[PDB]
Each structure stands twice: as C-alpha cells, then as structure tokens.
Write a protein that binds this ligand. Structure first.
Ligand SMILES: NC(=O)C1=CN([C@@H]2O[C@H](COP(=O)(O)OP(=O)(O)OC[C@H]3O[C@@H](n4cnc5c(N)ncnc54)[C@H](OP(=O)(O)O)[C@@H]3O)[C@@H](O)[C@H]2O)C=CC1
Lengths: 145, 973, 96, 49, 97, 97
C-alpha cells in the first residue's frame, strides 16, 4: 500500500497534475480479498462499472488512514461511496510477486462516439438496442432453466 | 487375573494408583465447587457474571486521520449540491461547513480552490449555486487557518410533542420550538427562567428574584448548597459565548464512559471531538457495528488535532478500571497512550426498573458497583497515577452525573442510593489529600428526553413543560455539560467544587411522582377510550350495513448495458476535431465482462461494493446462485405454479419474501469468512494433517494383503518385513520387523482461518455445465467457463459462433491466464497419488495454467486464433490485457478473451502464511477484528492480505468491429 | 475504616459498605416480605436508622460517609414505593 | 512386563484408565481454581472471607 | 529418484496397540490432536518427554515400493554444475534448479 | 517441496512457494543480471512455450514497448511428471522398448 501510493503520487507529480486535484483511490479488495491472478480482472470490472455509473465506491474498512500516506498529496482515500457527475478515466495498477508491475487506463466509452458520423452512430445505437433485447430474453431463459 | 497380579507384584507396579489419585482429585473438585457455589449464593449470578473483564490493550482502536476525512466531506457536499439533493443552506449544511472549517489547512484550501475554479457555472443553476457556496466557504476557511477548532452547535432546538389520533393512537415527535430557533436564544431563555422559578452579556437579563433554569450553587457556612447569582452569571456568560463563537477543547485529554449511541454521552463526545479534544471512549458492547459507528462519528466531527480511542470496558470490573487507567498513563514504548487526563466523565450506568426495596438483589448490587464504587475506584486510580509521577499542577476535572430526585419515583433498585452517595465528594475534596490531582464538578442533570434512562417518559414531557418547566433534548443537555469544560468553569472547579443545577426548574413542581403519574394515566385513558369507542362504532356499522389491491414487486434482473445518448450530447463531450481523426481498427474497447467471486457475479459484487446491501434483483440473484431457490413451472400440490420455490422444501417463495427468508444466510455464507471445509475437500485449518516418520521399535502384528501389495511392501522394506503366502486363500501376511520405517499421522493447528470464498452453494450445474465436465476438470476451470459465458452475455453475444459471421476463425484470441493454474490437480499428483488414492489418469493435463483456456475453446469458442497464456502472479490480469491489446493491434486477432483466475487450496494458504504475506487470524482475533474487517487496505493497522478465489473475464475487440457488430461498449482500453 | 482515603478504597471498604447499607436495605426487604406473605398490614416495624451528621467532612474513613448518606433515600422511598404499611422510617442523626 | 501386558489385553483391562480419569479431573480442578482466583482478584480477600 | 523403486504410502488400520515410543511434548500433542482417543500420551515425570501409544483402530501409513517402467530420460550431462559457470552457492541454495 | 516434503515435515525453506512460479525464473534473471524495468510477459504454452515466447517478444518489440527482448523456454524433469506422463501413455514404455 505504501509502495503503490508513492508510485501513483510520483506519476502525478511528474506529469504536472494540478495541486488540489488528487486522484480518488479505490480499494476493492477490502470486500473481496486477494485472488492471486484474478485481482486485476476484478479491478477492471469495477473500473468499467465506475465509468458507466459515475459512482465511486468507498473503502468501508478504511477506519484510520495510515499517517505515512498523508505525504502523498495527489491521492485521496475515501471511506464511503461518492455519487459524482461523471468519471472520465480510471487507472488500474497491480503488483505481482517476481517484480510483475502493470498498469492499465480505461477511458469513458462516450469519447469513442465523437470519432464517428451521426449516421454511423445512429445505426450502431439501433443495432445495440436490438442485441440487448435478445440478450435479456436469453439471459432469463438460461437462468430459470 | 491371579497370574497378572503375581506379575504386577513382582514388577512393583501398583495397579490402583491411578484410581486413588483420581478419587483425591475428585474430592478437590468438590471442595472448589462448594466454594464457588457459596460465592454464587452470596453474590448472585448477575453480579458474578457481570464482573467479567472486557478490557485489553490490543483491542484499542485509534482514529486520528482527520486530514483525509475533510476532503471526503467536501466532495460529498459538492456532489450532493450538484445533484440537487441539498437545495438550501439548512442547518445540516452549516454544521458540515463548520466541521470543514475545523479541519482547514493550506492543502484543503488548494483542494477547494481547484474544484471551484473548475466548476462550469453554465451547466445549469446547481453548478452556479455550488460555485457561490464554495466561494463563501473558501473565504471562511481562509480566516481560520491558524485558529483553534471550535465546538459550535447550530441545530434547531426541538421541543416535545405528543398527539392522539382519532382512533387513540399515541405518537411522540420532536417538533422544533417556535420561539427558540438558535442556541443563543436558548441560552437567553434559560437565563430568563420562569414564573415557577421565582421566589451586555446574557447574565444582565437574569430577573431580580428569579432562578435561572440553569444555575450554579454555593455552599453556605451551614453547609447547604444555595443558588449563587455571580457563579451562575459566569456559567451563563460562558454558555452565551459558546453558542455564538463556539468553544475550543484543544489540548484537553478526556476519558468518557457510557457514551454509546442514543445517550447524552454520545452528544458530549461529538462536541468534544469538534473542539479538538483527545478522547478515550469506552464501550461495554465492543463489536464491528460499534467500531464502525465511532469511525463515522470521527470522520464527521473529528477536528484537527483531535483523536478518538475506542476501548472495550466493563466499568463493573475493578480489574478493568485499573487496567484502563494504567493503559492511559503508560508510556507508548510500554504499550500505553502516554496521556495525562484533564477530565473524566463517568456516565456508564445500567437500568433498574421495577426493583423496589424488597427486590434489591444481585443486579442492583452490580449496578451500584458500576455507578458508584468503581467510579470512586477510577478517581483513585487516576490520583495514584498522577501522584506516582509527581504531577501536582494538572488536575483532572471529574464531571459527576448527579440526579435531582433521590428516591422520589421508586422502583429503581439502588439508583438513588448511588446518585446520592456521589455527593460526598464535594466535602471529601476538602477533607482528604487528592485535591491537586482531581477537581469535582457536580452536574445535576435534568429531564432529558430520549435516553436509555428516560425514553419511556417522552409522552408526558409536553404536559410537564405546560407546568412552566423545561425538559431538554440530549443535544441541549450535552451543550449544558460542555459548558462545564470552558476555561472559566475549569478554573472555578480548581478553586473549590462546583455544583451545577441543569434541572430546568423541575425541582419547583411539587409531588412530582403523582403529577407525572396523573399525566401518564390521562394520556393512556384517552388513548384507550378512543380506540375502544372507534372499534365499537366500526363493528356496529359493519353489522348494520353489512359487507385496495396491493402489488408486490417481482425481481426484474437487467443486463445493464451502457446508456447511449443522443448524438448531440455525445458530440458535445469530445473535441469537434476528433471526427475522422482516429483509426478505429486501432482503438481497443471492452464489450463485455464477468466474474465469479466471493460475492457472486459482477452484478451482485457491484451492488455489495457500491451500496453495501442487496436490492431485490441482487437478493434474488444471490439466492439463485447459492441454490436457495429454484424455478418451478407446473403443478405444485395439485395447483399450477409458476415462480420460485425453496430448493429444499419445494414450497413456493414470493420475490418479496426472498430477503426475509434468505438474506441473513446469504450474507453469512458470502465474502470473507471462516474457511468452510466442505468447500475445500475437507480442509480444516484447525486440524491440518501431517505425517511423521517413526522407526518401529518392536515387530508389528501381522496384517493381511493381496500378493501384489505384499510384494510391494517387501520391495520397499527388504529384510525388515516378512511376507508369507496363506495356503488357504492365496492372500499374504505382512509382518513389519524392528527397524522398519513407518509414518504416523499427526495434526497441526494453522492460524489462517478466514478466506474470501465463492458463496456456499455455488454450483456449476446451476449455470448448465454437465457433470462429465465437472468430474473431468479442475474447479478453477468451472469458474473460468462460467465467467467466459457470462462475459459473452454481457457483450450481447449468446451464441459465440455469431463472431464468425464477421471475422475469420483465425481472428478470435484468448489471452487470459493464471498465477498457478489447477492447484487441485497438482495436489492430486503430488499427494493423492503418493497415498495411492484413486486419481484420474489424465490428472496432469488438468493442472496446466493453459488448460483452462483449452477447455474454453474446446467447449464454447472453437477458434483457431492466437492463444497466449500469461503467468504474472498477482498482476496476471493486467498482463493479460496488455497481451490481448498487443495481439489485436498486431493484426493477429480482432477479438480477444482477457482476464485471470486462481483458486484457493490448503497448501498455498500454508505457504503464504510461512512467507507471512497473509494476515494471521489469531492475531486479528486478539485485536477484536471480525472476518469482515481483516481486509483493510491503507489503514494504520493493516498487516497482511486476505486470500480469495475466483475468475474475472473481459471481451476486448477493435472499436470498428464493435460498432459493426452492435455490441455494447463499456470503455476504451 | 481508618486511614482509608479515596485512593485506598478497596476490598475492606466495599465489604463495610455492604454491611452498613446494602444488607440493611436487604434486611428491611426481608421483613417486608415476611410481613406481606402473612397479610400483615397494620403492624409496621419501626426502623431506627443510624445516620451521621458529617458526610465526608473528616476524610480517611473509606466508604463510611457514602453508606451513611445513602440511608437518607429511605425518607423518600417510604412515600414512593409499596412497603410503608410494613415499615416506618425513623432517622436518628447521632451526635458526638 | 510383556507377559503382564498380554494378560491385561486378554482380560480387557485398561491399565491406564485411572491415570486418564485423574488427568481429566486435574484439568477440572485447574478450571475451578481459575474461576475462584478471578473472583478473589475482583472482590479481594477481605470481602470474600 | 529411482524409477525401479518408487516410494508410496499405504494406509493401514492398526489391529493391535503399538509399542510406546517417546516424543517431545509438542509432537505428542500433535499426535493426540490427530488421533483423539485412539492414542494415549503421558508425560514422563523424570525428563518431561512423553510416551505415545497408538491403540486399536488408529490409522497408520506403511511405505511400499513400486516398479515404474519409464527408466530413460534426456538428462543434462552428469557433473554439470552451476558453480562451474560462476553462480554462487547462496543463489544455488535459494532457487529451483 | 510444498506438496510432499512439507507433508512429511521435512525441512523446507520458508519461501519455497515463490521459487515454484513460472515467472520467478525471469524474476531472478532480472534481479541478478539485467536490472531492467521493461515488459515482462511470461507465457505458458506446454510444449509450444518457446514459439509462443518468440511470438510475444516480436509483438512487444513491434508495439514499441521494447527494443530488445529475451525469449525462450525451459522445463525440468522430476519424478511426478514422469509418472503422470506414463499414466497418460504419452512417453515410451522402456520395458517394451
Ligand atoms: N437520562 C437522564 O435524564 C439522566 C441521567 N443521569 C445520569 O447521567 C448518566 C448518563 O446516561 P444516559 O445518557 O441517561 O444513558 P444511559 O444511562 O442509558 O447510558 C449508560 C451507558 O453506559 C454504558 N454501559 C452500561 N454498562 C456498562 C459497563 N458495565 N461498562 C461500561 N459501560 C457500560 C452503556 O453503553 P454501551 O452499552 O454502548 O457501552 C450505556 O449506554 C447516567 O449515569 C445517569 O444515571 C442523571 C440524571 C438524569
């Protein structure tokens, strides 16, 4: 936890993040524990859910944030869920035994649509809506049977 | 028997020694039991069980990270205002802004300034409002950077209100008071007094010949305590200042007992923390719920420089009292706090109801101990700690909770005896030698609505007030008490004991017991009469004249595809120059995802993560996952039925009833919890099997075996075993000899007892996986198969072959991986085979990290695309994403399955414990932690990770293909 | 109880408190129960309470003053409870 | 000793029964003594006696 | 490892009490925890060790040997040693071959 | 070590678990020789591991994430794997040979 906070803090410092604008930390493992290889995938799922809902879950087991982490000004450690008006990008980091460090950045899907024309977007929307209705039908049939 | 006796005598072995010793021991047991029975007959069960210790130093919980909670509060306020939840600057908003000012520093100012300068006021009125309110808040916070935090209550005062409906229903409400809408106005009201209390600063307004509702008393030469105008003026001026400017408790160390939720002490504690105090708060019900309650109190009210220490405590135990004070005064190197107390607030008490003089028994004696004897012991312990260190100039102010009614109501056991006995301290302060270490502040507490000691009387408070007397809310009484911690009253107490009358003129009502009983009977009678009359009128109507449909929710589980806006808004979000600038074959997007984990699927895990509890759809999904409920369509007990039935009893279950029926068991068998051996092939960390090699000292008794087995034994042992055919049957006798090696099972206690486990009852058959597969593959593979299928459902792809209508079979990849693969198959090969257990012949293939992906392709996908399986320990999933993105961008695939998975098994847990990577569960118990709090990232006390199990999968693909296929896009990688 | 100041209050002072207050209340209660089990309502027992005029004024007496001051609740409990027909209260403030 | 053991096994007599029962009783004695010690630490010798 | 004599373990239920054998107190308690009432452990007053006596019905494991029919492999040349290449023995004792 | 030697209470180093990971070999290579902070993608491809490794290294270099890569493969021979390969009848029976 110390290593990772320091790393994210230096990343932000070097890249000229605005002072007073810390990144909001999410620590999903408080609830699920540590799978040894599925961890990043669970985080990726959480990050997509965050992006599409705008809701940032709080670390409910963060009773007392360690004092040594106060030095990292670009990181915030919430203990309760926050309903924002929009999350535009999420960072995912993981550190594995054997010097396995990794990072991924996921961006809000709505930025994709700015790249296409209106007609293409509208045809996509129609196709997606039809597919979603079929998926619901299949899901509930498969669930009950 | 005679031959055995002869041998025993020859060997000098007394065959009856053990029985003799046992009979002596049984006599000793009877003696000790008689002593214990006598003590239980003298003291009673309640007392004996109640003096059990609760306090231990390792269970203390510290809260001091106000530097972080302030930014959390700011953000919560900011987004609530942006969302219209808070439309007006009501008292709660003002209180929040006060708590933010109490934690203000330069970094917080930068935080607020950044977030306000970057608020776009053009996006509707809520944004302009947040910008204006933020600018005011910033200006206020800049003023108090170097100023001490203050306790300052801004709540609207409330009075009692009881109403009786037409049908005689009794309801009590705390309505705001019409004339008093601030605490300053409240202090003015108190200073005025009333007709019943009749015989520049607020104290100028105290009328001639009337007693204020709150006042101090001075002891006369004859030794009676009488109202003193000057001292009361001091007290009321202090209260006036507190109401207007607030009051700081910086550098004050305080111990408070009896401050649980719903008590006056809880309000006193929050006031103390608002003013910057260092507070130790005790509790007789130490639990996760109580520690979370205090954590939230600190996060809300803890000002800069304030600390809260929560300890378990039984004030009824003298060893607890002594250990608690010792802990407070011990140096930190010695495991204590290193504090010196400036105040003790011993408000702990237990209820005595219906205990009249003749019922006084064990419980009343124990309550007397708590509320008087051990309070004197706590004072004594503090006096000894202070004197052992030669501290003579830092006295601790003791705020004694005194009562104005001694024996006036009856039925309260020894409550009144305890309360009246506390009053001796006023004189003992002068007659003994502890006055330099302790001061005495007696608070005669008045009628306080809402406590465990007075709640049953809220309904007559209005009539009592009609008599011209004042009852108090707990917030008001806490404000009164905190008035006794101001510097002026503190100096006054150091001069001589002070007695504060916070009774609101109730002492002027004569025959109080009869008056309150009359009020209560009036109300009860009115209620009962009205109810009876209404019932009879209704029945008469129903006989003379003779003889709404409600709809229950049904769970409607949604897939939750991303919402798609109109092209106009979506065009507004990204730069106008982005159109046609990007090669959408080079943009990777996530079109579906899924997981199998300790909280079920990704839908239920997210509900638990974001909201802390399950909706109806989440509860039904968890019940179905865990096998509690199953669907039925047909005749059930003859009648047709379509819906959920209990899986075991087959009785119908309505969706609305799923929570009540199952939620408690769902929560008990989900998430981080004690390891359940049935989920891990009988693995029990409390009894871990081992084998110990022992050299045989004497020949064994022969045992039978088949010829092949016997030859294997002979091959192993050589001449240290004898095998002989049995002519009759053809079997063999096996006789191990001296010097032969043997293995004796022994058991070990392991201290890792908790893990994140997939919910009990989870079964791949529920998802539709046949049992030939289930018996073939390692369990991790079942987690992956379910996750891949669900991920494709989240992508809207129900038949994976649909992929081949858009891409070639060489363009669908699988880049998912694992840290360890099929560890259960590894156990098979390395242990089960070593013990000659039945192990499937192809077990080895089922252990490979890449076999999970092989089965995914062999059962669902049928692609001939890239297959790159990473192994990255705990970063496997991120490595998997990196590889899948590289594969798609290299043109080798247009769709990829990425993700990760791992299982939990005995050997890995033991080895993680040997490396000390995971949290020791016995140590966690020693600190009072339950399984649901052992995973606490980023906290002061974190000490090891919690092991879990499951799988997570995502589908990624080129954005161009995703658009063409019309699959949902959840994010861009 | 001699030389027992506030910080010395221990086993002996707790036992003395039991004798001089708690078990006096228990003795009153026992008499009340015996009288009521036999329906005796017109023959009250006068309890002569040994009270003290100095509560905490001298110090060093353990819980003596607490016991003595606590006995004074009975003046009011006689009126607030249901044992007044079986017991009466006569408080004697004994002098030097 | 070996002959005595053979006889004891033939007679089905457990030579260690008494010691087993005694060790259990000694555990019980320790439990009760711990309870009494706790009451004496909470109440003090003067009160208890 | 010798493929001609491959070690295995066979579970056998004890038919008659074993001869007592000595063990340290912790080991004896582990045996008692495993076997419950099918073992008797008694402190030896003189030394503080314990006697362990397995009883009828207790489980035991008897080594047995198996002949495997894979006897040949491509092996790195006999005498190959990482020290010859310069790898220190702290590494050699730390890592897997 | 973990599955058998520990089960028999043999002396096994406390960090044995880290030494079993497929990616620990590459971790030691970096920790003793290379000291890079470049990509580390460890494939597991049974008998096609080395070819998968080449594919990944080429993709990594062509993606611009690295300009040099160590590729290749490795595996050991031990008793349990030999037995299991014989049970699957993948290897040649030596007695038959
Ligand atoms: N209510 C009123 O109007 C008046 C109150 N008082 C006095 O003021 C004090 C305040 O209590 P009040 O606010 O009324 O609410 P309560 O009297 O209900 O509060 C007492 C608290 O003590 C704690 N407690 C109980 N047993 C123990 C124990 N063995 N060890 C440690 N703590 C224990 C409980 O909290 P938890 O279970 O959370 O630990 C409980 O909430 C009392 O002493 C009372 O006699 C005097 C006059 C009037």
């Amino acid at each position: 936890d110390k290593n990772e906070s320091a790393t994210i803090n230096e990343m932000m410092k070097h890249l000229g993040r605005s002072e007073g604008n810390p990144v909001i930390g999410v620590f999903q493992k408080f609830l699920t524990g540590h799978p040894k290889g599925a961890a990043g995938a669970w985080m990726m799922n959480g990050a997509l859910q965050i992006l599409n809902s705008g809701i940032i879950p709080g670390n409910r087991n963060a009773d007392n944030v360690d004092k040594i982490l106060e030095q990292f000004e670009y990181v915030l450690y919430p203990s309760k869920t926050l309903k924002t008006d929009g999350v535009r990008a999420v960072s995912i980091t993981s550190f594995g035994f054997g010097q396995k460090g990794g990072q991924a950045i996921v961006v809000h899907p709505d930025y994709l649509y700015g790249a296409i024309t209106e007609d293409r977007y509208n045809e996509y929307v129609a196709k997606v809506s039809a597919r979603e209705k079929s998926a619901y039908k299949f899901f509930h049939n498969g669930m009950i049977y | 028997r005679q031959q055995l006796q002869v041998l025993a005598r020859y060997l000098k072995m007394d065959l009856d020694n053990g029985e003799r010793k046992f009979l002596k021991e049984k006599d000793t047991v009877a003696e000790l039991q008689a002593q214990l029975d006598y003590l239980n007959a003298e003291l009673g069960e309640f007392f004996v069980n109640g003096v059990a210790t609760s306090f231990s130093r390792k269970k203390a919980r510290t809260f001091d990270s106000s530097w972080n909670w302030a930014k959390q509060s700011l953000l919560s306020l900011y987004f609530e205002i942006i969302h219209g939840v808070l439309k007006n600057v009501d008292r709660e908003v003002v209180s929040e802004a006060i708590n933010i000012m109490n934690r203000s520093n330069d970094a917080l100012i930068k935080f607020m300034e950044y977030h306000i300068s970057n608020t776009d006021e053009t996006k509707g009125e809520n944004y302009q409002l947040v910008k204006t309110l933020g600018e005011q808040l910033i200006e206020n916070c800049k003023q108090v950077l170097d100023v001490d935090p203050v306790y300052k209550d801004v709540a609207k005062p409330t009075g009692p209100k009881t109403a009786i409906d037409k049908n005689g229903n009794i309801t009590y409400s705390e309505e705001p008071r019409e004339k008093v809408r601030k605490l300053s106005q409240y202090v003015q009201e108190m200073a005025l007094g009333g007709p019943i209390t009749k015989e520049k600063t607020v104290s100028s307004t105290i009328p001639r010949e009337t007693i204020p509702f709150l006042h101090l008393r001075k002891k006369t030469p004859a030794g009676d305590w009488k109202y003193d105008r000057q001292l009361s003026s001091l007290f009321l001026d202090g209260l006036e200042k507190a109401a207007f400017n607030g009051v700081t408790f910086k550098d004050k160390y305080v111990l408070i007992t009896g401050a649980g939720k719903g008590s006056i002490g809880a309000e006193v504690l929050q006031g103390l923390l608002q003013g910057g105090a260092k507070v130790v708060v005790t509790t007789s019900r130490f639990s996760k719920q109580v520690t979370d309650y205090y954590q939230s109190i600190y996060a809300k009210y803890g000002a800069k420089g304030s600390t809260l220490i929560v300890v378990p405590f039984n004030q009824g135990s003298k060893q607890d009292v002594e250990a608690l004070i010792e802990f407070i005064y011990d140096t930190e190197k010695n495991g204590g706090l290193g504090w010196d107390l400036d105040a003790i607030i011993p408000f702990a008490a237990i209820p005595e109801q219906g205990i009249e003089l003749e019922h006084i028994d064990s419980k009343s004696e124990f309550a007397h101990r708590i509320m008087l004897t051990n309070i004197l012991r706590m004072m004594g312990c503090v006096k000894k700690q202070k004197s052992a260190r030669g501290i003579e100039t830092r006295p601790a102010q003791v705020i004694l909770p005194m009562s104005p009614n001694h024996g006036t109501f009856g039925g309260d056991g020894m409550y009144s005896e305890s309360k009246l006995s506390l009053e001796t301290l006023f004189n003992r302060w002068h007659s003994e030698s502890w006055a330099n270490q302790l001061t005495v502040c007696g608070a005669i507490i008045g009628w306080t609505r809402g406590t465990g000691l007075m709640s049953a009387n809220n309904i007559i408070a209005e009539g009592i007030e009609k008599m011209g007397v004042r009852t108090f809310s707990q917030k008001e009484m806490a404000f009164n008490l905190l008035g006794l911690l101001t510097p002026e009253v503190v100096e006054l107490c150091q001069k001589s004991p002070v007695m504060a009358d916070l009774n609101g003129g109730l002492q002027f009502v004569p025959e109080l017991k009869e008056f309150t009983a009359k009020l209560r009977k009036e109300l009860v009678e009115t209620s009962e009469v009205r109810k009876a009359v209404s019932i009879e009128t209704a029945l008469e109507h129903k006989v003379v004249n003779g003889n709404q449909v409600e709809i229950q929710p049904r769970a409607n589980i949604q897939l939750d595809f991303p919402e798609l806006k109109p092209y106009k808004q979506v065009k507004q979000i990204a730069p106008a120059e982005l159109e046609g600038l990007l090669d959408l074959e080079r943009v990777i997007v996530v079109t579906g995802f899924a997981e199998v984990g300790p909280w079920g699927s990704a839908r239920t895990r997210w509900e638990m993560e974001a909201f802390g509890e399950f909706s109806l759809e989440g509860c039904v999904e968890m019940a179905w996952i865990m096998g509690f409920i199953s669907y039925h369509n047909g005749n059930l007990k003859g009648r047709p039925y379509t819906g959920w039935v209990d899986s075991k009893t087959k009785e119908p279950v309505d969706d609305k009833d799923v929570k009540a029926k199952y939620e408690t068991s769902i929560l008990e068998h989900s998430g981080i919890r004690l390891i359940e051996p049935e989920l891990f092939n009988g693995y029990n960390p409390e009894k871990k099997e081992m084998i110990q090699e022992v050299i045989v000292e004497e020949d064994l008794e022969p045992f039978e075996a088949s010829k092949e087995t016997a030859e294997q034994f002979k091959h192993q042992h050589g001449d240290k075993v004898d095998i002989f055919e049995i002519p009759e049957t053809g079997e063999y006798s096996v006789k191990l000899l001296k010097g032969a090696t043997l293995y004796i099972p022994k058991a070990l206690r392991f201290d890792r007892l908790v893990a994140g486990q997939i919910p009990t009852g989870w079964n791949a058959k529920t998802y539709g996986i046949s049992d030939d597969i289930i018996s073939q593959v390692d369990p991790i593979t079942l987690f992956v198969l379910v996750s891949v299928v669900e991920a494709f459902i989240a992508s809207g792809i129900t038949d994976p072959y649909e992929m081949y209508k858009y891409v070639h079979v060489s363009e669908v990849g699988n880049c998912s991986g694992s840290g360890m693969g099929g560890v259960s198959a590894l156990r098979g090969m390395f242990k089960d085979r070593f013990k000659d257990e039945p192990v499937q012949n192809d077990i080895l293939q089922e252990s490979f990290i890449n076999t999970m992906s092989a089965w995914v392709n062999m059962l669902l996908i049928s692609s001939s695309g890239p297959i790159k399986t990473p192994v990255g320990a705990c970063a496997t999933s991120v490595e998997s994403v990196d590889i899948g993105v590289e594969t798609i961008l290299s043109g080798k695939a247009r769709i990829c399955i990425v993700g990760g998975y791992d299982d939990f098994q005995e050997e890995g847990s033991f080895e993680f414990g040997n490396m000390k990577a995971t949290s020791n569960t016995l140590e966690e118990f020693e600190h009072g932690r339950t399984p649901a709090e052992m995973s606490r990232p980023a906290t002061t006390t974190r000490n090891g990770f919690m092991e879990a199990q499951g799988a997570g999968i995502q589908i990624i693909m080129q954005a161009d293909l995703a658009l063409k296929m019309g699959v949902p896009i959840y994010g861009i990688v």
